[PDB]
From TrEMBL, chains A, E:
Positions annotated to bind glutathione: 147, 152, 213, 226
Family per similarity comment: Belongs to the picornaviruses polyprotein family.
Subunit structure: Homohexamer; forms a hexameric ring structure with 6-fold symmetry characteristic of AAA+ ATPases. Interacts (via N-terminus) with host RTN3 (via reticulon domain); this interaction is important for viral replication. Interacts with capsid protein VP3; this interaction may be important for virion morphogenesis. Interacts with RNA-directed RNA polymerase.
Function: Localizes the viral replication complex to the surface of membranous vesicles. It inhibits host cell endoplasmic reticulum-to-Golgi apparatus transport and causes the disassembly of the Golgi complex, possibly through GBF1 interaction. This would result in depletion of MHC, trail receptors and IFN receptors at the host cell surface. Plays an essential role in viral RNA replication by recruiting ACBD3 and PI4KB at the viral replication sites, thereby allowing the formation of the rearranged membranous structures where viral replication takes place.
Coiled-coil features, chain-numbered ranges: none
Protein name (record): Genome polyprotein
Subcellular localization, as worded in the UniProt entry: Host cytoplasmic vesicle membrane; Host nucleus; Virion
Automatic annotation (TrEMBL), chain D:
Entire protein: shown range: 72 to 315 of 2166
Protein name, entry field: Genome polyprotein
Protein source organism: Enterovirus F
Quaternary structure (record): Homohexamer; forms a hexameric ring structure with 6-fold symmetry characteristic of AAA+ ATPases. Interacts (via N-terminus) with host RTN3 (via reticulon domain); this interaction is important for viral replication. Interacts with capsid protein VP3; this interaction may be important for virion morphogenesis. Interacts with RNA-directed RNA polymerase.
Protein's job: Localizes the viral replication complex to the surface of membranous vesicles. It inhibits host cell endoplasmic reticulum-to-Golgi apparatus transport and causes the disassembly of the Golgi complex, possibly through GBF1 interaction. This would result in depletion of MHC, trail receptors and IFN receptors at the host cell surface. Plays an essential role in viral RNA replication by recruiting ACBD3 and PI4KB at the viral replication sites, thereby allowing the formation of the rearranged membranous structures where viral replication takes place.
Stated family: Belongs to the picornaviruses polyprotein family.
From TrEMBL, chain G:
Source organism of this protein record: Enterovirus F
Coiled coil: none
Protein localization: Host cytoplasmic vesicle membrane; Host nucleus; Virion
Section covered of the full-length record: 316 to 364 of 2166
Family to which this protein belongs: Belongs to the picornaviruses polyprotein family.
Assembly, per entry: Homohexamer; forms a hexameric ring structure with 6-fold symmetry characteristic of AAA+ ATPases. Interacts (via N-terminus) with host RTN3 (via reticulon domain); this interaction is important for viral replication. Interacts with capsid protein VP3; this interaction may be important for virion morphogenesis.
Recorded superkingdom: Viruses
Function summary: Localizes the viral replication complex to the surface of membranous vesicles. It inhibits host cell endoplasmic reticulum-to-Golgi apparatus transport and causes the disassembly of the Golgi complex, possibly through GBF1 interaction. This would result in depletion of MHC, trail receptors and IFN receptors at the host cell surface. Plays an essential role in viral RNA replication by recruiting ACBD3 and PI4KB at the viral replication sites, thereby allowing the formation of the rearranged membranous structures where viral replication takes place.
Protein name in UniProt: Genome polyprotein
Length: 271, 48, 243, 244, 271, 243, 49, 48, 48
């Protein structure tokens, strides 16, 4: 079972007045990092302190406050009036790096879609057009064209809006077949295959794809789309060592080796 | 800071539709900072 | 129809907004929450965990060697061993630590800091060093006498291999900016001071022993530490889509 | 008394099954995330067949081949349960079942003398990916009982900072202080149980952060030994033996 | 402690009927400005008054009523589809002069953004385009281009709207690291530097910048933006002598010396 | 969806509107309010503080000299010393005072005014002057006899260096406009009258003493004073962006 | 008029949305539900066959 | 003037989102107008 | 999953205007899976 409790606080710890200490008994400053434990020396034991009723809160560092805001996860333009986006958050590094701070996490999500019409030279147009975003779960048929039958969307969820209306937005629940999404997986995607391409990816994190189209054909122009995602009701487990190297691939955590993280200085004795 | 007069009423069927959680507490970090079997008091030496 | 008047802000997409919205799968029922060790509710739980400072960030040190503070048998007294600005969010040795990373995800900080040091020489190697914290106002102390006038601890190498120097929160304001960027914001205003280490006596060893040894430096936030105003971590970037 | 004065005694004895491990220079014992291994709850379970719980036949200490702390030593690591997948009845039960769940007791050993200096970080990392290569080699993702040598210790083989590995359950073997590290690890996963031949929940790493040095003429051959014991294990989905 | 109380009133003082007074005792009219105190002679003591039940309120001069309305703080046009505005209220004099009436003040703020598209000749266009305003706190990376990665805004707060929608608007809390914003600072921005350029500015008043862009590229046109700010929940301390000379610089209170404030008249004896 | 009908005004941005709006930082927790002396809750607290009137606004007076009312030994009787319209918000000697500045931030005012005068001659210098307030209807009084028929106070120079003349609120309406601009609005309708000062006897001094002396003039609002309708202060302006 | 602020999602047509909407025939009264054998409430009843 | 039937309900989490304060009182200006140690009654002479 | 704090208020006259039903239970499938006259216990043989 759990031998270490986790009592909750809503403010940081206060400082209590302390006095001098000349003894052979209590030695707060002496530590032993070898144990694997972080020092337990308090301010009051290292110096003489005053009373400080500290009312500073801890809200902005809660998982909900840290993750509870939208970030870009997809950005693309239609081709032939259609685009197929496989749902995954490895394309854009900012949100990706945030999620990788936890090993496992459960959360609902709010997706927001911002779309505009652009021409061949990628210049934005003031043109209102209806667009459809359809969620195609794995196993369902993905439309090949802008007018394929799958767009009937009688079972697949779809959202139809217009570039002239406010951004489209819908919430999605925690959908994994697992009991938490995994942001680090030391294993393979299947039995009987040990090729590197199938390592480090947990399939249950892939819930399908979003296919987008304009309901009718645009003449010479395309639909530009940005998809934002915002985690909600976050529950997380096992904090991880933060990413310290640039991302190189969308599906793997491969990186370029380095001999330093921070820049060098002239000498260790000059701050 | 936060309000003491906030109205929390859910308009939708699924909890996934609900707004962000409003707790935001922190907990004793011991399970991460001092995950040891034997208690080591701040006043004594760690190893003996 | 109930008379209404829509206001400014209508239709806008504020990334930090917090509204209720229709669910794509209204009747969906998620898998049960199971018992998983290590649940974290607030990242303050993480910054309180000690991590190594990339303190020896000089040309001659590559990789792992950058975590080691060089110590050697002296032939002169009161010499300096190392120096560092204590600010947790600025570029430098602290930026790659747990405390540094999260501090870099925020614009302001407050609280005492825990700097722990572990001596890694042989059991027979002895020594005493003094570690001092110099509150702001001037430049880093030039000699041991000057440094010794500030907050400090005298460390004696022995069975207990480590020592902690608490850099207490001593600031004019309740919070400090996490950057000291000057050219635009003049944030040098928030400099928190320096931490320096000096030989109190000397590192002494028996015959034929290594005359050089290392000290590892750890840092963590104290229980009165907090952060405010989330911002994107400057270290995470990209020049094009990833494939 | 050790618990009376508020400190941790430097001696320790670990007894599981028919095996006993002792050390006279320990530095307390770490319990990952403050949690001891536990059985799967009826409210968390999903597989319906009655599980197999081998007891002492599998929950005991297995010692792996030793590793030499060479001058060029960068570190060594082992995947769990991979490293024991072919040892004793633990290995047999792992091979004969689709599903496995269990905790661990890890004991890393490395003694030198009061004339040597050096420091090893002993860390147990959950879901530790070896992703320094575009296409990771199976020989490195699943090195077996021999374990594998580190090639990129500074970046922890996964693109993170070695110095921040302390966020995971760990201890240090600082030669002047101790000669062993002990870690108790609970089962961690986003699932109640999983396949022991397709997924490694933990990775044990032993990394030299302070190089091994010593008085001229002292013993230069210093081995590092790892002894691991599965704890509180259970298996489901019996069939013929299958290895990765 | 406080030796002078501050009882609150919701209406001005009434007038009570008074009669004649011929005495050597009470002499309300005699004063001594040297003490530093404002006269305490009342109407009832200087002349014979009648009863007046005065119900005039005092609401419109409260700090909330005085400051509680929007004022322009920024106005600019994008260049290359982007613009970087350092948050400070010294560019436009009206609101600036109001704030300088107090030494210290705490308040939340409501920011309102009004944007339109204009061409090269600065002629307004009827063109609806999506725009993004991102708040970049000090220390965060500021985007160099209209399409830089920072616009992913996974942590920085951003507001995305359209010139075709009503003005964008969001509230911000009292964000200073100090316990009040300071509108007068007799000190330097840092230790070890006494150059005039770093005098009279308290860094904690600068919370960062707002960077603006059109989500997609405009063709030959630019985005014109106006930012308004409205203080809310105002708490103020230490009233100051009002500005009496024109402002010359955005960051300092430098001014041109003058020998008079009001215009001259022929003689002191002719009103 | 609840049936609604949006009305006129929808989408407009009224600078004085007062709605609730989403916060950019919903979980932000501000620094504590600390004890700071001098809290002000209403600017009426400020206009009740006396400030100097730039009364001697003539060509020959520059800077500080403009605050001094000239007084000198007379060789004739009943002479005039100064004159001024009492209106607090119009251009003139009052415009640069505390009372004047705030009055200029509003369109209407009401209340009694406090005009205090301090004599600054030598201890040996004596004199008596009469200060009178003439309610509206005609022009400023031409001689002491005429002025004396209105509200007034006779001031005797002595140990108590100052005197107060209260210009009581005497108006047809409860409020008066703060400007007397005539060409467009015909606001001369609101003129509040005049304040004039005359020698009651004479300024008398000993041999070889300064035969000229000064009087400083202060003005403030009384406790029954109030302002309505905020407007931009006409004195604050700019011709281009500031850099 | 009650002050309101419309949000993202306004005007969108989510096929799985669940709102109340005006009826084309507000006073219509359907035929009675009669007794018919084999009522099914959930398709799990079918996959078990 | 002001209403006696005003509905004050906060829809948002943070107080910064709230509408303007509705108090608007004024206080005795003594701390600014008469910040002296010794009380000087209106009926007596200031200095003696 | 589903909320325990859902507000169900009908704004329209006809029930056809109402939102989707929120029950969603399942029933014993016997009428489809075992529509037989004679009960056949799981422990005994079906026919004898
Ligand atoms: C019909 C409206 C469309 C709206 C979008 C719905 C999207 C549904 C999919 C949600 C799945 C989110 C899983 C997040 C985890 C992915 C992590 C990873 O990339 O590894
Ligand atoms: C994401 C939406 C953007 C909206 C704008 C948010 C702006 C946040 C900054 C607020 C800081 C206000 C401080 C006012 C004090 C400045 C005084 C001065 O100029 O000296
Ligand atoms: N391919 C059709 C034209 C496209 C069409 O009508 N598609 C239909 C039936 S295949 C559809 O399902 N459309 C879905 C939609 O566009 O919404 C043809 O035979 O000309
Ligand atoms: N520079 C890119 C084009 C711009 C782009 O795609 N930028 C991405 C990744 S660098 C982004 O972060 N965009 C944010 C946004 O525009 O919303 C290229 O390689 O052509
Ligand atoms: Cl910096
Ligand atoms: Cl710096
Ligand atoms: Cl005028
Ligand atoms: Cl006039
Ligand atoms: K507290
Ligand atoms: K201790
Ligand atoms: K600590
Ligand atoms: K058993
Ligand atoms: K009254
Ligand atoms: K008096
Ligand atoms: K007065
Ligand atoms: K049967």
């Amino acid at each position: 079972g759990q031998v270490i409790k986790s009592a909750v606080r809503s403010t940081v710890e206060n400082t209590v007045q302390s006095t001098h200490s000349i003894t052979t008994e209590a030695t707060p400053a002496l530590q032993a990092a070898e144990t694997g434990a972080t020092s337990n020396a308090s301010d009051e034991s290292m110096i003489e302190t005053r009373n400080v009723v500290n009312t500073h809160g801890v809200a902005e560092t809660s998982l909900e406050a840290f993750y509870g805001r939208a970030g870009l996860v997809a950005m693309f333009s239609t081709d032939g009036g259609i685009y197929r986006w496989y749902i995954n958050f490895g394309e854009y590094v900012q949100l990706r790096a945030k999620l990788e701070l936890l090993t496992y996490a459960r959360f609902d999500m709010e997706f927001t879609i911002v779309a505009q019409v652009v021409n061949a030279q990628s210049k934005v147009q003031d043109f209102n057009v209806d667009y459809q975003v359809m969620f195609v779960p794995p196993g369902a048929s993905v439309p090949e064209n802008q007018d394929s039958y799958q767009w009937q969307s009688s079972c697949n969820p779809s959202v139809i809006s217009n570039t002239g209306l406010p951004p489209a937005r819908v919430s999605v629940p925690f959908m994994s077949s697992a009991n938490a999404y995994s942001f680090s997986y030391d294993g393979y995607t299947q039995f009987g295959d040990t090729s590197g391409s199938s390592y480090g990816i947990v399939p249950s994190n892939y819930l399908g794809m979003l296919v987008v189209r304009t309901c009718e054909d645009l003449d010479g122009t395309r639909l530009r789309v940005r998809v934002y995602a915002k985690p909600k009701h976050v529950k997380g487990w096992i904090p991880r060592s933060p990413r310290m190297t640039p991302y190189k691939s969308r599906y793997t955590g491969v990186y370029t080796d380095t001999t330093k993280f921070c820049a060098n200085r002239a000498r260790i004795t000059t701050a | 800071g936060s309000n003491i007069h906030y109205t929390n009423i859910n308009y939708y069927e699924n909890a996934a539709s609900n707004s962000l959680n409003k707790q935001d507490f922190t907990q004793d970090p011991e399970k991460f900072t001092r995950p040891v079997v034997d208690v080591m008091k701040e006043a004594a030496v760690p190893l003996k | 129809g109930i008379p209404t008047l829509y206001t400014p802000g209508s239709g806008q997409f504020l990334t930090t907004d917090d509204f209720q919205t229709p669910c794509m799968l209204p009747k969906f029922q998620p898998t049960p929450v199971i018992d998983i060790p290590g649940e974290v509710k607030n990242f303050l739980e993480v910054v309180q965990v000690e991590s190594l400072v990339e303190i020896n960030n000089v040309e001659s040190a590559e990789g792992v060697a950058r975590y080691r503070i060089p110590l050697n048998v002296q032939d002169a007294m009161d010499g300096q061993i190392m120096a560092l600005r204590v600010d947790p969010g600025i570029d430098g040795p602290m930026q790659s630590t747990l405390l540094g990373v999260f501090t870099r995800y925020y614009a302001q900080w407050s609280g005492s800091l825990d700097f722990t040091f572990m001596f890694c020489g042989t059991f027979m190697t002895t020594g005493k060093v003094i570690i001092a914290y110099t509150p702001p106002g001037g430049d880093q102390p030039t000699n041991r006498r000057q440094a010794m006038l500030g907050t400090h601890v005298v460390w004696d190498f022995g069975l207990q291999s480590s020592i902690t120097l608490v850099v207490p929160w001593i600031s004019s304001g309740h919070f400090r900016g996490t950057t000291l960027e000057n050219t635009i914001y003049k944030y040098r205003y928030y400099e928190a001071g320096y931490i320096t280490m000096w030989y109190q006596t000397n590192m002494v060893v028996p015959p034929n022993f290594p005359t050089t040894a290392s000290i590892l430096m750890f840092v963590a936030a104290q229980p009165n530490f907090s952060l405010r105003i989330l911002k994107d971590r400057p270290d995470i970037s990209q020049e094009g889509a990833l494939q | 008394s050790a618990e009376a004065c508020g400190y941790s005694d430097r001696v320790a004895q670990l007894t599981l099954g028919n095996s006993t491990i002792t050390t006279q220079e320990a530095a307390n014992i770490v319990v990952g995330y403050g949690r001891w291994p536990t059985s799967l709850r009826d409210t968390d379970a999903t597989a319906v067949d009655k599980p197999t719980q081998p007891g002492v036949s599998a929950e005991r200490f297995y010692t792996l081949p030793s590793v030499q702390w060479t001058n060029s030593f960068k570190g060594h690591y082992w995947k769990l349960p991979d490293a024991l997948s072919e040892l004793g009845l633990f290995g047999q039960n792992l091979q004969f079942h689709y599903l496995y769940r269990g905790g661990w007791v890890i004991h890393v050993q490395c003694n030198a003398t009061k004339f040597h200096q050096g420091t090893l970080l002993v860390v147990a990392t959950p879901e530790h990916k070896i992703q320094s290569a575009e296409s990771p080699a199976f020989a490195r993702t699943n090195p077996g009982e021999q374990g594998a040598a580190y090639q990129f210790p500074f970046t922890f083989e996964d693109g993170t900072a070695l110095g921040n590995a302390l966020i995971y359950p760990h201890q240090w073997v600082n030669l002047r202080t101790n000669n062993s590290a002990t870690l108790v690890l609970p089962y961690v996963n986003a699932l109640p149980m999983d396949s022991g031949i397709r997924h490694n929940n933990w990775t044990l790493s032993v990394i030299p952060i302070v190089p091994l040095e010593y008085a001229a003429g002292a013993t230069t051959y210093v081995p590092i030994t790892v002894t691991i014991a599965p704890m509180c294990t259970e298996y489901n989905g019996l069939r013929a033996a299958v290895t990765q």
